Design an enzyme around this catalytic site. Sequence first.
Site, mmCIF file in Angstrom:
data_model
loop_
_atom_site.group_PDB
_atom_site.id
_atom_site.type_symbol
_atom_site.label_atom_id
_atom_site.label_comp_id
_atom_site.label_asym_id
_atom_site.label_seq_id
_atom_site.Cartn_x
_atom_site.Cartn_y
_atom_site.Cartn_z
ATOM 1 N N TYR A 112 37.316 33.078 54.663
ATOM 2 C CA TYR A 112 36.918 33.370 53.304
ATOM 3 C C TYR A 112 38.006 34.213 52.647
ATOM 4 O O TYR A 112 38.212 35.378 53.003
ATOM 5 C CB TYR A 112 35.601 34.140 53.301
ATOM 6 C CG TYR A 112 34.967 34.230 51.939
ATOM 7 C CD1 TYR A 112 34.182 33.177 51.446
ATOM 8 C CD2 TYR A 112 35.158 35.348 51.135
ATOM 9 C CE1 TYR A 112 33.596 33.241 50.180
ATOM 10 C CE2 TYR A 112 34.587 35.425 49.872
ATOM 11 C CZ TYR A 112 33.799 34.372 49.400
ATOM 12 O OH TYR A 112 33.211 34.448 48.157
ATOM 13 N N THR A 123 44.043 41.436 31.785
ATOM 14 C CA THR A 123 44.183 42.566 30.878
ATOM 15 C C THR A 123 43.814 43.919 31.491
ATOM 16 O O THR A 123 44.489 44.919 31.248
ATOM 17 C CB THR A 123 43.337 42.302 29.628
ATOM 18 O OG1 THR A 123 43.725 41.045 29.086
ATOM 19 C CG2 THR A 123 43.500 43.388 28.580
ATOM 20 N N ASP A 162 44.427 39.792 55.460
ATOM 21 C CA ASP A 162 43.398 39.924 54.434
ATOM 22 C C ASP A 162 42.347 40.912 54.923
ATOM 23 O O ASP A 162 41.508 40.584 55.761
ATOM 24 C CB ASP A 162 42.787 38.555 54.086
ATOM 25 C CG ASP A 162 41.670 38.629 53.027
ATOM 26 O OD1 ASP A 162 41.204 37.548 52.599
ATOM 27 O OD2 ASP A 162 41.232 39.731 52.618
ATOM 28 N N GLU A 163 42.405 42.125 54.388
ATOM 29 C CA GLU A 163 41.533 43.212 54.835
ATOM 30 C C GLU A 163 40.562 43.654 53.751
ATOM 31 O O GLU A 163 40.162 44.807 53.683
ATOM 32 C CB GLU A 163 42.377 44.384 55.336
ATOM 33 C CG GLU A 163 43.081 44.073 56.639
ATOM 34 C CD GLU A 163 43.370 45.317 57.486
ATOM 35 O OE1 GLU A 163 42.803 46.397 57.190
ATOM 36 O OE2 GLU A 163 44.171 45.207 58.455
ATOM 37 N N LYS A 205 37.453 42.946 53.481
ATOM 38 C CA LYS A 205 36.128 43.258 54.019
ATOM 39 C C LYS A 205 36.169 44.423 55.024
ATOM 40 O O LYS A 205 35.234 45.223 55.130
ATOM 41 C CB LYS A 205 35.538 41.992 54.669
ATOM 42 C CG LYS A 205 34.325 42.187 55.579
ATOM 43 C CD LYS A 205 32.999 42.256 54.815
ATOM 44 C CE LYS A 205 32.277 40.926 54.858
ATOM 45 N NZ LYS A 205 31.349 40.763 53.706
HETATM 46 C C1 LIG Z 1 34.940 39.669 49.784
HETATM 47 C C2 LIG Z 1 36.181 39.093 50.447
HETATM 48 C C3 LIG Z 1 37.154 38.449 49.647
HETATM 49 C C4 LIG Z 1 36.994 38.289 48.165
HETATM 50 O O1 LIG Z 1 36.566 39.413 47.351
HETATM 51 P P1 LIG Z 1 35.676 39.138 46.054
HETATM 52 O O2 LIG Z 1 35.619 40.464 45.401
HETATM 53 O O3 LIG Z 1 34.375 38.643 46.576
HETATM 54 O O4 LIG Z 1 36.425 38.062 45.370
HETATM 55 C C5 LIG Z 1 38.317 37.926 50.207
HETATM 56 N N1 LIG Z 1 38.527 38.041 51.571
HETATM 57 C C6 LIG Z 1 37.584 38.668 52.388
HETATM 58 C C7 LIG Z 1 37.824 38.770 53.870
HETATM 59 C C8 LIG Z 1 36.413 39.194 51.832
HETATM 60 O O5 LIG Z 1 35.606 39.738 52.579
HETATM 61 C C1 LIG Z 2 42.803 38.010 27.186
HETATM 62 C C2 LIG Z 2 42.247 36.619 27.040
HETATM 63 C C3 LIG Z 2 41.798 35.884 28.148
HETATM 64 C C4 LIG Z 2 41.864 36.434 29.535
HETATM 65 O O1 LIG Z 2 41.274 37.717 29.814
HETATM 66 P P1 LIG Z 2 41.876 38.600 31.000
HETATM 67 O O2 LIG Z 2 41.040 39.820 31.000
HETATM 68 O O3 LIG Z 2 43.289 38.844 30.592
HETATM 69 O O4 LIG Z 2 41.763 37.718 32.176
HETATM 70 C C5 LIG Z 2 41.271 34.609 27.961
HETATM 71 N N1 LIG Z 2 41.188 34.063 26.693
HETATM 72 C C6 LIG Z 2 41.644 34.764 25.592
HETATM 73 C C7 LIG Z 2 41.551 34.148 24.221
HETATM 74 C C8 LIG Z 2 42.171 36.045 25.762
HETATM 75 O O5 LIG Z 2 42.563 36.677 24.781
HETATM 76 O O1 LIG Z 3 46.700 38.282 24.884
HETATM 77 C C1 LIG Z 3 46.957 38.963 25.861
HETATM 78 C C2 LIG Z 3 48.403 39.190 26.262
HETATM 79 C C3 LIG Z 3 48.704 38.627 27.655
HETATM 80 C C4 LIG Z 3 48.252 39.552 28.781
HETATM 81 C C5 LIG Z 3 46.735 39.538 28.896
HETATM 82 C C6 LIG Z 3 46.131 40.386 27.783
HETATM 83 N N1 LIG Z 3 46.002 39.533 26.604
HETATM 84 O O1 LIG Z 4 31.503 38.317 52.070
HETATM 85 C C1 LIG Z 4 30.971 38.129 50.990
HETATM 86 C C2 LIG Z 4 29.721 37.277 50.893
HETATM 87 C C3 LIG Z 4 29.994 36.026 50.062
HETATM 88 C C4 LIG Z 4 29.910 36.294 48.559
HETATM 89 C C5 LIG Z 4 31.108 37.099 48.061
HETATM 90 C C6 LIG Z 4 30.962 38.558 48.490
HETATM 91 N N1 LIG Z 4 31.456 38.658 49.863
#
Ligand SMILES: *Cc1c(COP(=O)(O)O)cnc(C)c1O
Ligand SMILES: *Cc1c(COP(=O)(O)O)cnc(C)c1O
Ligand SMILES: O=C1CCCCCN1
Ligand SMILES: O=C1CCCCCN1
Lengths: 426, 422
Positions: free
Chosen positions: B136, B281, B224-225, B227
């Site tokens: 995962y 952002t 990947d740590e 968890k």
């Molecule tokens: C939870 C987890 C992720 C992803 O984190 P999210 O915040 O759920 O996207 C990736 N790798 C491991 C081993 C995890 O436990």
């Molecule tokens: C900033 C922005 C996103 C993405 O948001 P993030 O927080 O940067 O991921 C997507 N669509 C529009 C129109 C945005 O301005």
């Molecule tokens: O429109 C923007 C600029 C690009 C970086 C993400 C924040 N939003």
């Molecule tokens: O390990 C987990 C459970 C699966 C859903 C994402 C959160 N992390």
Amino acid sequence: KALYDRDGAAIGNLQKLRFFPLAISGGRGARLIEENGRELIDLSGAWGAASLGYGHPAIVAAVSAAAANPAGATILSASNAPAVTLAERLLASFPGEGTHKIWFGHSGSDANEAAYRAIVKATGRSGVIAFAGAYHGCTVGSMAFSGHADGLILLPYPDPYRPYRNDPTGDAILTLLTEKLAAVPAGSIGAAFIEPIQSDGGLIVPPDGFLRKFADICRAHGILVVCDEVKVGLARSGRLHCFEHEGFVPDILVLGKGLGGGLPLSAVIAPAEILDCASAFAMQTLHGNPISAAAGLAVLETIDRDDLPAMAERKGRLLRDGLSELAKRHPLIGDIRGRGLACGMELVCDRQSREPARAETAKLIYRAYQLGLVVYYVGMNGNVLEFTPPLTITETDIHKALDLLDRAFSELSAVSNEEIAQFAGW
Amino acid sequence: TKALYDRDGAAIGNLQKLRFFPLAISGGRGARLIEENGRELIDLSGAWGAASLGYGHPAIVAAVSAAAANPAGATILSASNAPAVTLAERLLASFPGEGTHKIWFGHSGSDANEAAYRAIVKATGRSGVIAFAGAYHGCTVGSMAFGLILLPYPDPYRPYRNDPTGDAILTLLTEKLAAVPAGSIGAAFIEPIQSDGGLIVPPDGFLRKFADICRAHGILVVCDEVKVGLARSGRLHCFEHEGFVPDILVLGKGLGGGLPLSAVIAPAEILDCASAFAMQTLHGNPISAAAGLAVLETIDRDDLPAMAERKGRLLRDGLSELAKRHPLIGDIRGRGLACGMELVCDRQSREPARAETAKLIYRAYQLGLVVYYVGMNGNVLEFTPPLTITETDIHKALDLLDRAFSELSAVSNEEIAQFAGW
Ligand SMILES: *Cc1c(COP(=O)(O)O)cnc(C)c1O
Ligand SMILES: *Cc1c(COP(=O)(O)O)cnc(C)c1O
Ligand SMILES: O=C1CCCCCN1
Ligand SMILES: O=C1CCCCCN1
């Protein structure tokens, strides 16, 4: 030794979008505070994420109470109240109907991606309409349909200042849409992604009536209309929702940035049938966490309590007035556009040819920064100044910002090409 | 004034729901969640490991409140900010580390893993990836991308090709590499304890060996740590148990102690290969950063890895006593406060008891205990409580767990069916 130098040594360039050596240690209202104590007025509001500015009392109170007694840390494997209350509060503000549900994320990128994946899952239709120069996000999922996925159809944005095929109505774009749709199996496109004001293209307000027509073509072909209001959402346009200007209601609303008022928070408002087609499907551990949701609710409560759409409408005319005032003195200013506190100023080499002044824009914002004004540029040719200030910015801050901007236009040549080359920008 | 859980069903869509029982939370204090009705439950989940400091920890409250009151902006994209920078230095100080590595900040493990993969491809041109079956790495298009060499995780409890050493997995790896051009594989993604596989600690030495083979082939080792990192294993970083150092470290979950915050620790060359490349952002935002700092500070100050090592053994010792009374328990495994309990229908057959596992956590929920299951087979109970959980909290949860095993038949198939779960 200095904070900016330390940043260069500790943090990779991968996520950097630096235009000048801005190094921040604090914030108050619409001001950022550099390491030394120098105060800058922030006309960017962190690209609009600082909806209520910095250290707002309602954010402070909300986030402090949430941290002291948190309702868990997730909406995934538990229901929590702050998220549920925020979900209903967002649901209330959306008409309709509805039969609509909330999905919570960290960002606009993860929310646009979720919206897409949910549509394809719920309907089987993987085709997507999106606009050229569109910014929907920087994840592999949300970049798939952003501007430069299979079954991606890219359309020109209805840009008044640079009309496609030199047709100012946009009728040519709708005609192109029509040609594009019939070159593709009936019912194969599931979604149309729309920015009501195009952020990354140059804060472009489309020609009046175009989006309504575009939506009507979409609804006639089975296509769900997704309104990406991450940048211009929630009061910034001078209305609670930006589509309220365009005489149509989207099937799906994507929210982000300013929603969290400073914390990572996004949301998809989508019909129940789209969000209920799967479970454990688009998920990350801290989605719908109580601290982020608390702040989100403080943004909404403050919007309502302070009539912030009305404020953004007022402060935005004041800002645009002043910018026109600058045009009358500075030939580089070709175009002022925008709604509420989402404003764009395009800088050009000649007002007739409307050729992009990229090098002058970069020197401008760099100089502006040196004078105490934080503003960034955006757009295809790097020639568009973007103003998305805290919605709680005072008129006094705006006047001061205009004087500093005027000074930065006059003092632009001071900036050497080697100073500018230190900063990659986009 | 409806039921909280029923309000949830009507406002919030099913797309992100991982629901096993009608848990509806209104508060938290230490390792205890407070439901709408004022019943405290002992949280053995710690929100899948995110609530590393528990709920309402003074350090988190102080740092978050102060950050909210005087935020150094809202981003790291377009400004440098002091909290983000201070935390980056601190993470690099915890890694070896010096002048070779840089930090990239994210919201979550999914985006952090996605950033690592994109950066590697961009920097080196090597798009080929090695990863483990059952891994995962997150739930986004980018992090579920992993052209691909898939290997079995070396599970002592379920060996590959009848080799409990794990050496047949190293042999398969050798074959797959020989089969594809040299310099086509850029990265190996490893969990040093496999989460979704059911909290599997690999056999001793395997990962050290695995890392040698990778470096021998010019392949970057990504640990990947998300968890299992940050004090949770009994050391600060889980790879310290494994006799190797990874090229890249992915951190998340517990890192924010309740806020979204992830990080990639990667060679400077990988992270400096492009700009405006992988960004959102609110990345490096000061409120999350300050919360990250409070976590790292508390880990050192209240010696949390040692506490995790202590409380872990005490937890797993208690579970071994349950195994003497409950034949369902087949394998107790883990390091520190990251533990698994595999439930089986026969200890010799090692046949998975899925149906009984669901009832158990449902039952345990009714009793005042929050605990979940994982694994391909749905038969491994995950224990990841606050690193802060008390010795009293542990004994008390052991009795409840005992009581949960005795009372499985009290929960029906129709109650289980009302919750979609995985
Ligand atoms: C939870 C987890 C992720 C992803 O984190 P999210 O915040 O759920 O996207 C990736 N790798 C491991 C081993 C995890 O436990
Ligand atoms: C900033 C922005 C996103 C993405 O948001 P993030 O927080 O940067 O991921 C997507 N669509 C529009 C129109 C945005 O301005
Ligand atoms: O429109 C923007 C600029 C690009 C970086 C993400 C924040 N939003
Ligand atoms: O390990 C987990 C459970 C699966 C859903 C994402 C959160 N992390």
